[PDB]
Swiss-Prot record, chain A:
May form a homodimer or a heterodimer with a related family member. Interacts with OLA1, TMA17, and UBR1. N-acetylated by NAT1. The chain holds residues 52 to 152 of 405 of the full protein. The 26S proteasome is involved in the ATP-dependent degradation of ubiquitinated proteins. The regulatory (or ATPase) complex confers ATP dependency and substrate specificity to the 26S complex. The gene is RPT6. Belongs to the AAA ATPase family. It is found in: Cytoplasm; Nucleus. It comes from Saccharomyces cerevisiae (strain ATCC 204508 / S288c) (Baker's yeast). This is 26S proteasome regulatory subunit 8 homolog.
Swiss-Prot record, chain C:
This is 26S proteasome regulatory subunit 4 homolog. The gene is RPT2. The keyword ATP-binding applies. GO terms for biological process: nonfunctional rRNA decay; peptide catabolic process; positive regulation of protein catabolic process; proteasome regulatory particle assembly; proteasome-mediated ubiquitin-dependent protein catabolic process; protein-containing complex localization; ubiquitin-dependent protein catabolic process. It comes from the Eukaryota. GO terms for molecular function: ATP binding; ATP hydrolysis activity; proteasome-activating activity. The keyword Lipoprotein applies. One of its GO terms (cellular component) is proteasome regulatory particle, base subcomplex. It is found in: Cytoplasm; Nucleus. There is a cross-link at K160, K181, K216 (Glycyl lysine isopeptide (Lys-Gly) (interchain with G-Cter in ubiquitin)). The chain holds residues 75 to 437 of 437 of the full protein. The 26S proteasome is involved in the ATP-dependent degradation of ubiquitinated proteins. The regulatory (or ATPase) complex confers ATP dependency and substrate specificity to the 26S complex. Has ATPase activity.
UniProtKB/Swiss-Prot annotation, chain D:
Its main location: cytoplasm. One of its GO terms (cellular component) is nucleus. Keywords: Acetylation, ATP-binding, Cytoplasm, Isopeptide bond, Nucleotide-binding, Nucleus, Proteasome, Ubl conjugation. This is 26S proteasome regulatory subunit 6B homolog. Belongs to the AAA ATPase family. ATP binds at G127, P128, P129, G130, T131, G132, K133, T134. There is a cross-link at K194 (Glycyl lysine isopeptide (Lys-Gly) (interchain with G-Cter in ubiquitin)). It comes from the Eukaryota. GO terms for biological process: positive regulation of RNA polymerase II transcription preinitiation complex assembly; proteasome regulatory particle assembly; proteasome-mediated ubiquitin-dependent protein catabolic process; ubiquitin-dependent protein catabolic process. It is found in: Cytoplasm; Nucleus.
UniProtKB/Swiss-Prot annotation, chain E:
The gene is RPT4. The chain holds residues 264 to 350 of 437 of the full protein. N-acetylated by NAT1. This is 26S proteasome subunit RPT4. It comes from the Eukaryota. It comes from Saccharomyces cerevisiae (strain ATCC 204508 / S288c). Belongs to the AAA ATPase family.
Length: 101, 92, 363, 257, 87, 51
């Protein structure tokens, strides 16, 4: 029955405007986080009441809500390669046995 | 060149017959081979080859095996692989 | 009781009413943008990262002095009005800038140069540490010093000890980084160098190893000979045409400064010309004891013995033998370095490591 | 699932996040995070799979079939064959190397696993421009008679910002559906150059066009069932980073004089 | 691509070129202050006369003040077959 | 590999870009990448012309 009730109540969730995509840059003591949206500009929003600014840092992919324009949760971090071209190789496979003579 | 920047200067000697003998078996260790070949005889025909030329012989070793449609690499492929690599170094 | 009613009571009442207005003032999204220009009517124009254009009125939480063309401010969602100015923290632009705070250096390791130290200390460290000498006398200290001499004299450690005692901002500009691939970025870089150094403290400007424009040598960066003047004259106009009271101290040093344009040296602003030569047998005895102070030496090793063997060597050649002697004993892993390691180390430095040319010789 | 039934915004899937929740990228350029419809599943789609989005809310509605739209979608055969391989002589030296690195792995993929040799994921071409590089590729398309994709190097550039990178990933998706697929890019040096990569403050980056080339090729070709053929002018023009291990190692130069 | 789009519609069409000193040259990419628009412009003129698209009813008349300012790749056969000199 | 480090190359061709404040930052930007991660062992690429 709960599976049937959740599907019939999905119409309210489908009509929700959704959320944007942005990255965290810096924070302040006012609980206002700086979110940089890739297609759009930058927007300073308020963190959720269930979270705080202690778990937020620079270069963090998060979820920015649409209608209320506030932070929801944290998605993922920033990838290892940065800027234009960044070569990151940790613990290669080359050893002394691979080099003869 | 003056001290204070580079504290150690290592001179790399060019590969030799005894040097390329142990290098040839390492690059060929990742592919199929045949015990009927010789490690120091193949490197003896090559003279003045760099480390990329040794890997080129190993890389081209499996190319000639695809023409005969066989899963093994005999002495016939090594003789054709060296002749192709030696021509690339003497060209240009 | 009486004062708390006239101080704490009206203050807490205004702060609670101000926070209630912050919800209507500062919205949820709080869009931002780039400020272009301001007008005396309290109206400005701000451009968001999406490149729009708007004209609104300047609201509270900002003044006329805090507004500068080219800065970033805070906007509003529906009305697009300016909420206030947003200061820029965590360095102005670049985080890899050579600016540091109180590095580790002393005057004991630079010993032997005191003849050349007295000139640079009075023109740099003295006005910063004791400003009452130049201000009360009426003289104006020079705006910078320049160094010249043979390579290997250790001209880098001369200005390194200044940053520790002055306890101020210390900047470094590589002479090879002065130019840029894109034409026009040369003066744009040098303009930002003096801009950052001029905002916070007199500080220090130290430029070392200038290969710029000298005997070409860069074929991957093409200036067309026109970028040569625009990049170099930018450093000249900042040391002459730029208005300054003598706070900015710019130091330039490299192997040979004679190949540079003497007009770029700007004579009369730099009153200190310091020359460096090879030390004698008396000075090398003090320099050798510095590098061997933290080193464990055997009983048979004598400091006066190695100095006698040293012939035509600079300060960098002495440290090379102490480093090489430590590596020779490192292979055998000995606590105290014996005398046989110093004998083999001093021979390899002056032979393979140091290549002694004839230059001017005529025996 | 039938609530919408009306015009929908074309989306593209990116990464899974939560159960019945995923991030999507609309063709409008603005990425949104919505919830996956209950009748759908995260396993029924692909990381690069293109989906549909609601008109206003941009919520996920229906998953489009595994085919995309760039230009004509390039089915690959319309009146294509004209000449054959026998009509061009003298290239038999370079023709044998291409047929072994292109036509051979598409037929028997187990030959490389037995000999222990990693087949190149594609083949480049070098030498003086304006002579060859169109003769050998045309002979392979007629001899193989399979999926073939011919897209110009500068064709990936679109008048819209976000449309450029979206059309790059859409080419590799069509090659994954049909196993004997050959991707051909004529004059790739337009979007791939030595340095020159930073466009500074003109529009965004434009490096993303090159980033998608390195991202899609390095993440795909796990079964080595897709090969990419590119033509250029000289070697000094192309990005030298393309010859590193882990990506295409093939180098073929047209003999001069 | 818009000009050559009318070749398949109207078959008896001949597209001219008027005194090209710029987009006909080679000028590979080193620096050059983001020339990619002109760089890709050269790639389009070398596309329609190269790729598998077949027309045969469309002629390309290109006029210039000197052959040295033109891309040597464009001067190769397969694109400009006959060079008519007007001394 | 034996030192358990992160191998990072240096391409001197792309180290010079043009931005606002980042123009000359890209040259020495690789220094910061070796700060946050101590096991660097920076390697140099694109040495000279081999022909």
């Amino acid at each position: 029955n709960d599976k049937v009730r959740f599907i019939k109540d999905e119409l309210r969730l489908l009509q929700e405007p959704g959320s944007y995509v942005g990255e965290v840059i810096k924070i302040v003591s006012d609980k206002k986080v700086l979110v940089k949206v890739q297609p759009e500009g930058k927007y300073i929003v308020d963190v959720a009441k269930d979270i705080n600014v202690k778990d937020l840092k620079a270069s963090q992919r998060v979820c920015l809500r649409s209608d209320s324009y506030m932070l929801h949760k944290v998605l993922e971090n920033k990838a290892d390669p940065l800027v234009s071209l960044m070569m990151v190789e940790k613990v290669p496979d080359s050893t002394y046995d691979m080099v003869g003579g | 060149l003056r001290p204070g920047r580079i504290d150690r200067k290592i001179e790399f000697p060019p590969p030799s017959v005894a040097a390329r003998a142990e290098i040839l078996r390492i690059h060929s260790r990742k592919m199929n081979l045949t015990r009927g070949i010789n490690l120091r005889k193949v490197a003896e025909k090559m003279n003045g080859c760099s480390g990329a030329d040794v890997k080129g012989v190993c890389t081209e070793a499996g190319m000639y095996a695809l023409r005969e449609r066989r899963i093994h690499v005999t002495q016939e492929d090594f003789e054709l692989a060296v002749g192709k690599v030696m021509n690339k170094n003497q060209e240009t | 009781f009486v004062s708390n009613s006239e101080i704490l009571k009206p203050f807490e009442k205004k702060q609670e009413e101000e926070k209630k207005q912050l919800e209507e003032i500062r919205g949820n999204p709080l869009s931002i943008g780039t400020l272009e220009e301001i007008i005396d009517d309290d109206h400005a124009i701000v451009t968001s990262p999406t490149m729009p254009d708007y004209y609104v009125s300047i609201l509270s939480f900002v003044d006329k002095e805090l507004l500068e063309p080219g800065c970033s401010v805070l906007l509003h969602h529906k009305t697009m009005s300016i909420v206030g100015v947003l200061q820029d923290d965590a360095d102005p632009m670049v985080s890899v800038m050579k600016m540091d705070k109180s590095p580790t250096e002393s005057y004991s390791d630079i010993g032997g140069l005191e003849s050349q130290i007295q000139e640079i200390k009075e023109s740099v460290e003295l006005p910063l540490t004791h400003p009452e000498l130049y201000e009360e006398m009426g003289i104006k200290p020079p705006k910078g010093v320049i160094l010249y001499g043979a390579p290997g004299t250790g001209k880098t450690l001369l200005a390194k000890a200044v940053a520790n005692q002055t306890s101020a901002t210390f900047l470094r500009i590589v002479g090879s980084e002065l130019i840029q691939k894109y034409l026009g970025d040369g003066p744009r870089l040098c303009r930002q160098i003096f801009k950052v150094a001029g905002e916070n403290a007199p500080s220090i400007v130290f430029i070392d190893e200038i290969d710029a424009i000298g005997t070409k040598r860069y074929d991957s960066n093409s200036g067309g000979e026109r970028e040569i003047q625009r990049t170099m004259l930018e450093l000249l106009n900042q040391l002459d045409g730029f208005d300054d009271r003598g706070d900015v101290k710019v130091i330039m040093a490299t192997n040979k400064i004679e190949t540079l344009d003497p007009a770029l040296i700007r004579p009369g602003r730099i009153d200190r010309k310091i020359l460096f030569e090879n030390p004698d047998l008396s000075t090398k005895k003090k320099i050798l004891g510095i590098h061997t102070s933290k080193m464990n030496l055997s009983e048979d090793v004598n400091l006066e013995t190695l100095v006698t063997t040293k012939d035509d060597l600079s300060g960098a050649d002495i440290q090379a033998m102490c480093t090489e002697a430590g590596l020779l004993a490192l292979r055998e892993r000995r606590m105290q370095v014996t005398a046989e390691d110093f004998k083999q180390a001093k021979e390899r430095v002056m032979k393979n490591k140091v290549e002694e040319n004839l230059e001017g010789l005529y025996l | 699932k039938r609530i919408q039934s009306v015009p929908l915004v074309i989306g593209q899937f990116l990464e899974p996040i939560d159960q019945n929740t995923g991030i999507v990228s609309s063709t409008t350029g603005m990425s949104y995070v919505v919830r996956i419809l209950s009748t759908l599943d995260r396993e029924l789609l692909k990381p690069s799979m293109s989906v549909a989005l609601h008109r206003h809310s941009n919520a996920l509605v229906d998953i489009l079939p595994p085919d995309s739209d760039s230009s004509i979608s390039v089915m690959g055969e319309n009146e294509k064959p004209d000449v054959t391989y026998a009509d061009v002589g003298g290239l038999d030296m370079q023709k044998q190397e291409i047929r072994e690195a292109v036509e051979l792995p598409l037929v028997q993929a187990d030959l490389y696993e037995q000999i222990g040799i990693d087949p190149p994921r594609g083949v480049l071409l070098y030498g003086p421009p304006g002579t060859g590089k169109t003769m050998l590729v045309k002979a392979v398309a007629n001899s193989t008679k399979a999926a073939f994709i011919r897209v110009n190097g500068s064709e990936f550039v679109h008048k819209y910002l976000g449309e450029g990178p979206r059309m790059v990933r859409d080419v590799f998706r069509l090659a994954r559906e049909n196993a004997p697929s050959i991707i051909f890019i004529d004059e790739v040096d337009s979007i791939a150059t030595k340095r020159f990569d930073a466009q500074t403050g003109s529009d965004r980056e434009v490096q993303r066009i090159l980033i998608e080339l390195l991202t899609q090729m390095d993440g795909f070709d796990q079964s080595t069932n897709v090969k990419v053929i590119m033509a250029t002018n000289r070697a000094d023009t192309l990005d030298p980073a393309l010859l590193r291990p882990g990506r295409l190692d093939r180098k073929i130069e047209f003999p001069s004089l | 691509r818009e000009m050559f789009a009318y070749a398949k519609e109207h078959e008896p069409c001949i597209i001219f070129m008027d005194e090209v000193d710029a987009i006909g040259g080679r000028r590979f990419s080193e620096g050059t202050s983001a020339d990619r628009e002109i760089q890709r412009t050269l790639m389009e003129l070398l596309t329609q006369m190269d790729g598998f698209d077949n027309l045969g009813q469309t002629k390309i008349i290109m006029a210039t003040n000197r052959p040295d300012t033109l891309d040597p790749a464009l001067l190769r056969p397969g694109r400009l077959d006959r060079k008519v000199e007007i001394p | 590999h034996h030192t358990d480090c992160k191998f990072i190359r240096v391409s001197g061709a792309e180290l010079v870009q043009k931005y606002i404040g980042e123009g000359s930052r890209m040259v020495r930007e690789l220094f910061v990448m070796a700060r946050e991660h101590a096991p660097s062992i920076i390697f140099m690429d694109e040495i000279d012309s081999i022909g």
